[PDB]
Design a protein around this ligand. Structure first.
Ligand SMILES: [Mg+2]
Length: 385
């Protein structure tokens, strides 16, 4: 029995077909009801010789818990999120399809699904998640994912301890795809809404006090991820940054999501911004303030990260150029997109100049901080303060 492709195609198509039927429904409530029925049907055919390509390890799909999926918010479309139970195997080509067994945080979902699943006792059981978008073009997300992976590889190679979290994208059609969500994390919006704390106070409560290893560890993770995404947002010109599309994980890292406006995507910023990455007071406070060692570390990481990126520039630009040749995406706008991208690597600068640039960029990223208004008047008047 060779690895047959038709089962897999039918599986992927079934997920898209579900989305299409949900999209005929006006209300979220109705889509939720329909989704339960749809997933129950899917389970008729499982386990099967099919896989979720976003897994990143060989496995068979065994179950899609039909009550546990989520219809996501959409004005027009019908995006949805499913949890998918799989059994890991070492080699998919040699492994037989598993025999059927008859019938909040990530951590609680995993617990509840495992307990309710006839497969949940198996040691090779794993829960995966995927967002199915049957009417959204994900090629721009895929480009971002490819670039993020490349930057991650560059920083690893150059031993720069920046941290980012590329999330997997599958492009199905020109107007459909799949996204592996980042599950161990909540938007900063919700972290603040639920806790009613600043991020600093949240860290002190959740991780520990200033003298604790946990606090320092979380702070280090926050800085390394902040620096990583600062560079990502600058190089890719990621726009539409807000607390709804920045997540916080249980380790203190931030994760940027939703790359719907990158590179030359309209509308262009008219406020002379170097990047839409904004370093708020709240963020600077987590780093222990403007004069703090962790803020200095942040700036050092930005410089070492940019040095590393610059050194391997062609690896990143090539990814963008290949995507541009194949596709007519909104983030491309004729010649200038690539020119401007290359210029953001600062190939002509010395490391001394790059250090000065990082200072300017960091200063600019805090432009929304009220202190900058208060203490910026020397640039706007003939006074020296
Ligand atoms: Mg002046």
């Amino acid at each position: 029995e060779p690895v047959r492709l038709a089962p897999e195609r039918e599986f992927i198509k079934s997920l898209m077909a579900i989305g299409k039927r949900l999209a005929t429904l006006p209300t979220k409530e109705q889509k939720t009801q329909r989704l339960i029925s749809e997933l129950s049907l899917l389970n008729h055919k499982l386990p099967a010789r099919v896989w979720l390509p976003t897994a990143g390890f060989d496995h068979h799909v065994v179950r899609v818990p039909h009550t546990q999926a989520v219809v996501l918010n959409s004005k027009d479309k019908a995006p949805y999120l499913i949890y998918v139970e799989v059994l890991e195997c070492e080699n998919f080509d040699t492994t037989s399809v598993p025999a059927r067994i008859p019938e909040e945080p990530w951590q609680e979902k995993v617990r509840r699904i495992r307990e309710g699943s006839p497969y949940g006792h198996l040691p090779n059981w794993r829960l995966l998640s995927v967002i199915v978008k049957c009417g959204d073009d994900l090629r721009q997300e895929l480009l971002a994912f490819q670039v993020l992976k490349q930057l991650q590889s560059i920083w690893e190679q150059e031993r720069v301890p920046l941290w980012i979290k590329p999330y997997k994208i599958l492009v199905i059609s020109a107007d459909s795809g799949m996204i592996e969500p980042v599950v161990n994390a909540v938007s900063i919006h919700q972290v603040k809404k639920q806790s009613q704390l600043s991020l600093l106070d949240y860290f002190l409560q959740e991780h520990g006090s200033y003298t604790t290893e946990a606090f320092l560890s979380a702070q280090r993770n926050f800085v390394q991820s902040c620096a990583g995404y600062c560079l990502v947002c600058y190089l890719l010109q990621v726009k539409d940054r807000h607390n709804g599309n920045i997540l916080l994980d249980a380790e203190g890292h931030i994760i940027h999501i939703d790359f719907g406006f990158i590179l030359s995507s309209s509308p262009r910023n008219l406020g002379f911004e170097t990047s839409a990455f904004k370093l708020t007071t709240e963020f600077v406070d987590v780093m222990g303030g403007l004069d703090g060692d962790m803020f200095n570390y942040y700036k050092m990481l930005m410089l070492q990260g940019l040095i590393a990126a610059r050194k391997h520039m062609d690896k990143v630009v090539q990814i963008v150029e290949i995507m541009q040749q194949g596709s007519q995406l909104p983030c491309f706008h004729g010649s200038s997109t690539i020119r401007n991208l290359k210029e953001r690597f600062h190939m002509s600068m010395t490391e001394e100049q790059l250090q000065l640039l990082v200072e300017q960029m960091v200063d600019g990223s805090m432009r929304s901080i009220t202190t900058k208004l208060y203490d910026g008047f020397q640039y706007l008047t003939n006074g020296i303060m």
